[PDB]
Design a binder for this molecule. Structure first.
Ligand code: FES
Ligand code: FES
Ligand SMILES: [Cl-]
Ligand SMILES: [Cl-]
Ligand SMILES: [Cl-]
Ligand SMILES: [Mg+2]
Ligand SMILES: [Mg+2]
Ligand SMILES: [Mg+2]
Length: 907
C-alpha cells in the first residue's frame, strides 16, 4: 500500500491505495465519485475518461502507480454540479446530447481536455479528438455531441453569451414540438444519476455481490456441480444452484402462439439438466464483493457431457437434426403469408422477375453500460427487483412462476439505465437476482462485465431469406414470394412473434396484391434471440429493399422512381391486407428527389480511379404498438404543492420517457396553463405505477402518450370550475373531490394477424421513412466510408425535436454498424466493442440529415406516431445499395467486411 497526496476536483486528497489498483475503482469505490462511469473495463469506450495532469485518460486502464504524488485529477464532479453547470454541461442539455446519459460524463470530461488544448476546434478537430480518446456513444450518432462542444467553445471563447446555452421558451408557451430539454439531462451531465452499478456501490454492508458460474461449451447434459473449493474462498457466503429455486425454475414466453410446437417454458432460470448455449448461468456465487465472488466462481466445478451444438439456423433446421429441447422439433413455428392470388402463374407471365438470397446476422446491442440488477426482500415481505427491464409488468409475469412467487409478492422497478436497444425486452438477470435474494434473505447485486454483456444477453436473430418479385415493364409490382428462417438460439421468448414480423414487413411500402411466403423459427445453440430495435424489419426490409434495387436494375429504371411508382397510395393495402393510415411516401420521395439527383452528380464528379462514390436509397416502415388492440394507462395527479405527477410505467432505455411524458402532458394540460417544470414523471414500478406496457415496438408515444392525454383531459374535467376556470388543490380537498385521475387508451381498431394467412390489422399507427446513403468505397482495400445519411421521416407530429432528432441519428449510426462492421458470430472474438465492430465517431458521418414530412396520424396523440425503430428499419439497405451504385457489386450477406467487398470486386 502507498500514501498518495493528490488533488481531485480542486480538493487535496490524502489517498491510501494499492499501486496496482485501477484509478476507476479508487475514484468510484474509495472516493465515491460514481460520475466516473465504467462500461467496457478495457479502455475501449471512454466512459471513464478523467483528466490526469492535463491529459485525458481512461481510468479503467490507469493503475495508481501512474498517478504521481501531487497529480491533478478532474472528474465530471469537478467539471460542474447541478446549479453550477459548466458551459459544456449546459451545451449538452441544450443539444439533447444526454439520451441514456451513460457516456455523458466521459464525453464532457474529454471535451474539457480538448478545449483546454485547442480553444477553437473545427468540427473535424472535435471528431478526431473523440476518436483518439475512444469516446463511444450508442444513443446519439455523435452529431449532437459535436454540436454541443462547438456551442460551448463559442461561449468559453467569449464569442457568445453563456445565457444562450439556456433554453428559451417559445413564448407560445408550447413545449410540444419544441427543443425543450429533458428533465433527466442535468443529472446525467453532472454524473448525479445513479445507474445500477452506481447503486451497487451505495448499497449497505451486508449486501451480497453475485458472480455467475457459466457454461464454457455451447451444448451439454449437466451431471453435477461441485462447490466445495468455492465455499472456502475469501468473502464467500454461499453458492446458489437450481436446487435453491422455489418455483418452476423456468421463464415463460407468456404469449407463445398456439401454433408454436413448443410450450414456451423452455428457458431455465438456473440450468438443471442441460446447457443450451455458451454462457448459460449454472450457479451464482454470493460474496462480500464482486471481485471475491468472481474469483470463487472460477473454482466452481461443473461436470458435464458436451453434446454436438447447432450453431446456425440451417444446421439446426436439418430434417435429421437432434432436438435441442427433447420433445419439441428444432423448427418450432411457421408463419404463412397468403395474400391475393396464387403467385406461381403471375411469376410465369410477368414481364420481369427478380430473386435474391440475403442474410442479416446476430447483431449485438452494445449499450455502453453492461447489464446490472439487484434484488432484496422488502420489510413488507415482498421480493423487489431493480434492473434494466424495459417492460416491468411483462417481466414480472414472465418470471414469477419460475421464481416461485405470486404476482402480488414480487415488485419490479426500472433503474436509470445506459441503453438497451431491445435486449431488455427479455429478462436477463431479474430471475437470477430474485432467486438469490429469496434464498439468502439478503440484498444481492449482480453486475455483468462486457464479455458477459456480449456472450450472455440476447441478440438480433439471424435470418436466412429468399425473396422474389414479379413486375410489369413499367415497374408495377404484381406479386412477391418470400421464405425466411429465423435462428432464435435456444430460448423461445417472442421468437414466433419475430417470425410473424417477416409476413408484415418483407416488401412493406408498396402495393403488392399477391403474396405467398413462409417464415420458420428454429432453436439453435447460438445466442438466444432478444428484440433488437427494428425487430424483424432490419432483416425483412434489407431483403426487400435490396431486391427493389435489383428489380430497378433489371428494368433499367432509376431505383427512386421505381419506389415512387409502387409506394402506398389511397386504395392500396400493406402485406397483411390492411389500408395504410396515412400516405406520406410519395410526398417524401418527391421532396428527396432533387437531393438524390444532386448526390448522384456529386458521386460521379468526385469518384476517382481508386475511390468510388455511390448513392443508395431505401424505404422503411414499422408499426407503433404491440400487435392487436394494445392499451395503456396513466394517472394524472394534482399534488398539494400545485405540481402535477403523471404516473406511468413508460420505461426509459434512454430514448426520453421523461420528456415524452412531460411534453405530452404539457400539451394536454394547456387549458389549465401548467408550466412544464411543474409536471413530474414516475420511474416504472409494478406496485405503484399502472401497466402502461413495455417500451418495445416503438409504442409508448402512441399508447402511453394517448393514455397520458386522456388522463390529463380527465384531470382538467376534475378541476374545472362551474362558470370557467379551475379549482386549486386545497379547494378540491376541502370539497372532498378526487385529485388523482385515471386515463386509459386502447388501439381499438387493431386485430392480430391470422395464423393461417398472416392477414390482419396488427397496428393502427405506422412510421414511414425514406433513406439516402452516400458512400465511398476504396477498391484497393474494400473499405466503405459512409459520407452522409439522409432520412425523410413521417412521425405525424413531434412531441420533442431534441428527442426525435437524437433517435434518428442513433438509429442511422446502428444502421452503419449493421451494414459494415457489426456481428456476434465468434463467441470470443466478438465479445469486445472493438472486436464486434462498434462504430466509433469517424465511422459515422458528421452529415446526418433529417427532413420531417409529418402527416398527422388519426389515432396518435396530437397526431404523433412513434420514432424509436424507424431509423433502423432499412438504413443498411440504403448503404448496400450505395455500395452497388459505387462499384457494381452487391453484398447479399451482412456485414460488408472489407475482405468480403474485395472478393466481390475482384470476382
Ligand atoms: S474505457 Fe474505461 S470503462 Fe470503457
Ligand atoms: S447517450 Fe451516449 S451511450 Fe447513451
Ligand atoms: Cl430482431
Ligand atoms: Cl454476400
Ligand atoms: Cl475484413
Ligand atoms: Mg461557469
Ligand atoms: Mg394501383
Ligand atoms: Mg479472401
Amino acid at each position: 500500500m502507498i500514501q498518495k497526496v493528490i488533488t481531485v476536483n480542486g480538493i487535496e486528497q490524502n489517498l491510501f491505495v494499492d499501486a496496482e489498483a485501477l484509478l476507476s475503482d479508487v475514484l468510484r469505490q474509495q472516493l465515491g465519485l460514481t460520475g466516473v462511469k465504467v462500461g467496457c473495463e478495457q479502455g475501449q469506450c471512454g466512459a471513464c475518461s478523467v483528466i490526469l495532469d492535463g491529459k485525458v485518460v481512461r481510468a479503467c486502464v490507469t493503475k495508481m502507480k501512474r498517478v504521481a504524488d501531487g497529480a491533478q485529477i478532474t472528474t465530471i464532479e469537478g467539471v460542474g454540479q447541478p446549479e453550477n453547470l459548466h458551459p459544456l454541461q449546459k451545451a449538452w442539455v441544450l443539444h439533447g446530447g444526454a439520451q441514456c446519459g451513460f457516456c455523458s460524463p466521459g464525453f464532457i470530461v474529454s471535451a474539457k481536455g480538448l478545449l483546454d488544448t485547442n480553444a477553437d476546434p473545427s468540427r473535424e478537430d472535435v471528431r478526431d479528438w473523440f476518436q483518439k480518446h475512444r469516446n463511444a456513444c450508442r444513443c446519439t450518432g455523435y452529431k449532437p455531441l459535436v454540436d454541443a462542444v462547438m456551442d460551448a467553445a463559442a461561449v468559453i471563447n467569449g464569442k457568445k453569451p453563456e445565457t444562450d446555452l439556456e433554453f428559451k421558451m417559445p413564448a407560445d408557451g408550447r413545449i410540444w414540438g419544441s427543443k425543450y430539454p429533458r428533465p433527466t439531462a442535468v443529472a446525467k451531465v453532472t454524473g448525479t444519476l445513479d445507474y445500477g452499478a452506481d447503486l451497487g456501490l451505495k448499497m449497505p454492508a451486508g449486501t451480497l455481490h453475485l458472480a455467475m458460474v457459466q457454461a464454457k461449451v455451447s451444448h451439454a447434459n449437466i451431471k453435477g456441480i461441485d462447490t466445495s473449493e468455492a465455499l472456502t474462498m475469501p468473502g464467500v457466503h454461499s453458492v446458489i444452484t437450481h436446487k435453491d429455486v422455489k418455483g418452476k425454475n423456468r421463464i415463460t414466453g407468456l404469449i407463445t402462439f398456439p401454433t408454436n410446437k413448443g410450450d414456451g417454458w423452455d428457458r431455465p432460470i438456473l440450468c438443471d439438466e442441460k446447457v443450451f448455449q455458451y454462457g448459460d448461468c449454472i450457479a451464482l456465487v454470493c460474496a462480500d464483493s464482486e471481485a471475491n465472488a468472481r474469483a470463487a466462481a472460477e473454482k466452481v466445478k461443473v461436470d458435464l457431457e458436451e453434446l454436438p451444438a447447432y450453431m446456425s439456423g440451417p444446421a439446426a433446421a436439418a430434417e435429421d437434426a437432434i432436438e435441442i429441447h427433447p420433445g419439441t422439433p428444432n423448427v418450432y413455428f411457421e408463419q404463412p403469408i397468403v395474400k391475393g392470388e396464387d403467385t406461381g402463374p403471375i411469376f410465369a407471365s410477368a414481364d420481369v422477375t427478380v430473386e435474391g438470397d440475403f442474410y442479416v446476422g446476430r447483431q449485438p446491442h452494445m449499450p455502453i453500460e453492461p447489464d446490472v440488477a439487484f434484488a432484496y426482500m422488502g420489510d413488507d415481505g415482498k421480493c423487489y427487483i431493480h434492473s434494466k427491464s424495459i417492460g416491468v409488468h411483462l417481466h414480472l409475469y414472465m418470471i414469477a412462476p419460475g421464481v416461485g412467487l405470486e404476482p402480488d409478492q414480487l415488485v419490479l422497478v426500472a433503474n436509470p439505465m445506459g441503453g438497451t436497444f431491445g435486449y431488455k425486452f427479455s429478462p436477463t438477470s431479474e430471475a437470477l437476482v430474485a432467486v438469490a435474494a429469496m434464498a439468502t434473505g439478503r440484498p444481492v447485486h449482480l453486475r455483468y462485465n462486457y464479455q458477459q454483456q456480449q456472450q450472455y444477453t440476447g441478440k438480433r436473430s439471424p435470418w436466412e431469406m429468399n425473396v422474389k418479385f414479379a413486375a410489369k415493364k413499367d415497374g408495377t409490382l404484381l406479386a412477391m414470394e418470400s421464405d425466411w428462417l429465423v435462428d432464435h438460439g435456444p430460448y423461445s421468448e417472442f421468437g414466433d412473434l419475430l417470425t410473424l414480423r417477416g409476413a408484415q414487413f418483407i416488401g412493406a411500402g408498396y402495393n403488392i396484391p399477391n403474396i405467398r411466403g413462409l417464415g420458420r423459427t428454429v432453436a439453435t445453440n447460438h445466442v438466444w434471440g432478444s428484440a433488437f430495435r427494428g425487430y424483424g424489419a432490419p432483416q425483412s426490409m434489407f431483403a426487400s429493399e435490396c431486391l427493389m434495387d435489383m428489380l430497378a436494375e433489371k428494368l433499367g429504371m432509376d431505383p427512386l422512381e421505381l419506389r415512387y411508382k409502387n409506394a402506398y397510395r389511397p386504395g392500396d393495402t400493406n402485406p397483411t391486407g390492411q389500408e395504410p393510415e396515412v400516405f406520406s411516401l410519395p410526398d417524401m420521395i418527391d421532396q428527396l428527389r432533387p437531393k438524390y439527383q444532386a448526390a448522384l452528380e456529386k458521386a460521379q464528379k468526385e469518384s476517382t480511379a481508386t475511390h468510388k462514390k455511390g448513392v443508395g436509397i431505401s424505404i422503411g416502415v414499422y408499426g407503433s404498438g404491440l400487435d392487436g388492440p394494445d392499451a395503456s394507462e396513466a394517472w394524472a395527479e394534482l399534488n398539494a404543492d400545485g405540481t402535477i405527477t403523471v404516473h406511468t410505467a413508460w420505461e426509459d432505455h434512454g430514448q426520453g420517457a421523461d420528456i415524452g411524458c412531460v411534453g405530452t402532458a404539457h400539451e394536454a394540460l394547456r387549458p389549465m396553463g401548467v408550466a412544464p417544470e411543474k409536471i413530474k414523471f414516475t420511474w416504472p414500478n409494478t406496485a405503484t405505477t399502472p401497466n402502461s406496457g413495455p417500451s418495445g415496438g416503438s409504442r409508448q408515444q402512441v399508447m402511453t402518450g394517448n393514455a397520458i392525454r386522456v388522463a390529463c383531459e380527465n384531470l382538467l374535467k376534475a378541476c374545472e370550475k362551474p362558470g370557467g376556470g379551475y379549482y386549486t388543490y386545497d379547494e378540491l380537498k376541502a370539497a372532498d373531490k378526487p385529485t388523482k385521475i385515471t386515463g386509459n387508451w386502447t388501439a381499438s381498431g387493431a386485430t392480430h394477424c391470422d395464423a393461417v394467412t398472416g392477414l390482419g390489422k396488427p397496428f393502427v399507427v405506422y412510421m414511414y421513412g425514406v433513406f439516402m446513403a452516400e458512400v465511398t468505397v476504396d477498391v484497393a482495400t474494400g473499405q466503405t466510408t459512409v459520407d452522409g445519411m439522409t432520412l425523410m421521416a413521417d412521425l405525424g407530429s413531434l412531441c420533442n425535436q431534441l428527442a426525435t432528432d437524437g433517435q434518428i441519428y442513433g438509429g442511422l449510426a446502428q444502421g452503419i454498424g449493421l451494414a459494415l462492421s457489426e456481428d456476434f458470430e465468434d463467441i470470443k472474438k466478438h465479445a469486445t466493442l472493438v472486436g464486434a465492430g462498434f462504430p466509433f465517431i469517424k465511422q459515422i458521418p458528421d452529415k446526418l440529415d433529417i427532413v420531417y414530412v409529418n402527416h398527422p396520424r388519426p389515432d396518435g396523440p396530437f397526431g404523433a406516431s412513434g420514432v424509436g425503430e424507424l431509423p433502423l428499419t432499412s438504413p443498411h439497405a440504403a448503404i448496400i445499395n450505395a455500395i452497388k451504385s459505387a462499384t457494381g457489386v452487391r453484398i447479399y450477406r451482412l456485414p460488408a467486411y472489407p475482405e468480403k467487398v474485395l472478393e466481390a470486386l475482384k470476382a
